[PDB]
Design an enzyme around this catalytic site. Structure first.
Site, PDB file in Angstrom:
ATOM      1  N   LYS A  97       0.837  -1.185   0.000  1.00 41.11           N
ATOM      2  CA  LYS A  97       0.000   0.000   0.000  1.00 41.11           C
ATOM      3  C   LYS A  97       0.879   1.246   0.000  1.00 41.11           C
ATOM      4  O   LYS A  97       1.766   1.401   0.855  1.00 41.11           O
ATOM      5  CB  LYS A  97      -0.898   0.034   1.217  1.00 41.11           C
ATOM      6  CG  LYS A  97      -1.900   1.193   1.205  1.00 41.11           C
ATOM      7  CD  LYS A  97      -2.798   1.189   2.446  1.00 41.11           C
ATOM      8  CE  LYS A  97      -2.182   1.933   3.628  1.00 41.11           C
ATOM      9  NZ  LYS A  97      -2.118   3.399   3.427  1.00 41.11           N
ATOM     10  N   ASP A 120     -13.894  14.108  -4.471  1.00 40.16           N
ATOM     11  CA  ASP A 120     -14.261  15.233  -5.324  1.00 40.16           C
ATOM     12  C   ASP A 120     -15.676  15.011  -5.919  1.00 40.16           C
ATOM     13  O   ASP A 120     -16.380  14.053  -5.551  1.00 40.16           O
ATOM     14  CB  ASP A 120     -13.170  15.405  -6.401  1.00 40.16           C
ATOM     15  CG  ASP A 120     -13.026  16.835  -6.883  1.00 40.16           C
ATOM     16  OD1 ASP A 120     -14.063  17.512  -7.065  1.00 40.16           O
ATOM     17  OD2 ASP A 120     -11.877  17.268  -7.113  1.00 40.16           O
TER      18      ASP A 120
END
Lengths: 224, 231
Positions: free
Chosen positions: A32, A64
């Site tokens: 990750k 967003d």
């Protein structure tokens, strides 16, 4: 056999290459990386690594408007990544556009990256949830709400605490990935028993004398 | 003095270079790029642009734990950008860390990028605010609360709608940037009158037959402080 993902905390390609060289053969290595690395490295860094066979959980927690996240997700999917995150706080439509975007950018003969929703970040205390975020609900309820909604909207899974997986897993069912970070030898065996689909492990591996041996031993503790 | 920022919604460097060639001299142009471009093109493209003198609003809306945002923000300040965004929903400490990261990543001599807080996205309606995000406050109250907190947490400004400026300003004051995107020939004149610190303009410029002249005309309108004679 459920995956063990090594959480990396580094800010350049050189550091990244070094730890990866210590973790094993590329096909065996699932890592990750977040914005501390992605925003510091050439756009082709992730793609080059995934070409070699490294599996990458690219953890950028996209938050967003739906159309912009469609396009962001689409761009990420063309890197060859395996998992990626969005904020559930961005809402149902954004999540759906995220998945549509992932589908759209996945290159021929690749698996579509799995879309994981973040609920409430670990940096969000009870006080912050109430007084900064002006949430109407307490933590346990906020989290279950978001995770359910993520599942309804096309997320493939959720990032959740090992101590929440039991009850989240009860609610939402088996058709979902419960990805639990903060595991230390909350042990890998406990995470398995409580329903984790994948564990994310950091320092116990990355700071180990031999990261490869540590990583391989955790896999076995998780899958025995 | 007040900036007009051109919103570039494109996913490739070749389309970017074409619109840019029509906007004027790099030192006169301020553009906004988001996830769409940055996640395709990456950091080299931004570094290239700012070295030429372009001002960039790099709009990535960072939303993660304080330490990670510190490092994300630091990484972005190395690129020589001018404005960047974070989610106020990420909380007080995250905003402070973002600003500290911006400071740490700014090359000496250079100006520290302005940190702008996103409040509630335009994609969040009242119903989404209430029943998806489980907010206990109505929209206007939640927006003001996030904005005030951002100000008290090291943010230099907020993204808000032209109409919101008055309430936000009333509460937060002049030592702050009110950055307003909805603008089309809400006009630049109205944005000016309502106290916007900066406007972002998209298609009215990027799809104009003469983008440079459309840009210069909007800069002019937005900055017409003494438009009319008065005594």
């Amino acid at each position: 056999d459920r995956p063990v993902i090594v959480a990396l905390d580094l800010d350049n390609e050189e550091q990244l290459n070094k730890i990866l060289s210590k973790l094993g053969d590329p096909h065996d290595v699932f890592v990750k990386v977040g914005m501390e690395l992605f925003y510091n490295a050439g756009i082709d860094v992730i793609k080059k690594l995934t070409q070699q066979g490294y599996k990458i959980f690219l953890d950028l927690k996209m938050h967003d408007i739906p159309n912009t996240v469609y396009n962001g997700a689409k761009a990420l999917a063309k890197l060859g990544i395996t998992f990626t995150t969005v904020h559930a706080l961005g809402g149902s439509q954004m999540i759906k556009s995220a998945k549509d975007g992932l589908i759209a950018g996945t290159p021929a003969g690749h698996s579509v990256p799995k879309l994981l929703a973040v609920t409430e970040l670990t940096s969000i205390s009870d006080d912050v949830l109430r007084n900064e975020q002006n949430c109407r609900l307490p933590m346990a309820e906020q989290v279950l709400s978001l995770a359910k909604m993520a599942k309804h909207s096309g997320a493939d899974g959720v990032i959740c605490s090992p101590l929440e997986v039991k009850k989240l897993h009860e609610n939402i069912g088996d058709d979902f990935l419960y990805v639990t970070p903060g595991i230390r030898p909350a042990t890998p065996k406990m995470a398995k028993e409580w329903g984790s689909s994948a564990i994310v492990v950091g320092r116990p591996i990355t700071l180990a004398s031999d990261p490869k041996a540590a990583y391989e031993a955790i896999k076995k503790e998780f899958n025995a």
